[PDB]
Ligand binder design. Structure first.
Ligand SMILES: [Zn+2]
Length: 112
């Protein structure tokens, strides 16, 4: 099967469908109807349950980005489903954690 271009295959973004998600970045519950992010990794406080989709707030996932293992080549523009958020949230995620384009992600010479 073909490789993905919208995600690096390690972290995700969506609106919070529920208050059942809790931010591991500060240990407070994530609010329904606003953005929530997660990373896939084995939980370091309970490794026995294996790789989980560990949830974080829009501020907190940037605060621990370097613990989560982000690099500029694959910032918030490489989260799952990021493109389906509102334009103001897509801008605000990049404004805190922006991705490098110099790899040739969009030159204006792809489909044009
Ligand atoms: Zn938080």
């Amino acid at each position: 099967g073909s490789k993905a271009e919208k995600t690096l295959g390690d972290f995700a973004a969506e609106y919070a469908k529920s208050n059942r998600s809790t931010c591991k970045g500060c240990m407070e519950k994530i609010e329904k109807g606003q953005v929530r992010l997660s990373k896939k990794m084995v939980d370091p406080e309970k490794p026995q349950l294996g790789m989980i989709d560990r949830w974080y707030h829009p501020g907190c996932f940037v605060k621990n980005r370097e613990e989560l293992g982000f690099r500029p080549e694959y910032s918030a523009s490489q989260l799952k489903g990021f493109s389906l958020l509102a334009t103001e949230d897509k801008e605000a995620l990049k404004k805190q954690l922006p991705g490098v384009k110099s790899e040739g992600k969009r030159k204006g010479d792809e489909v044009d």
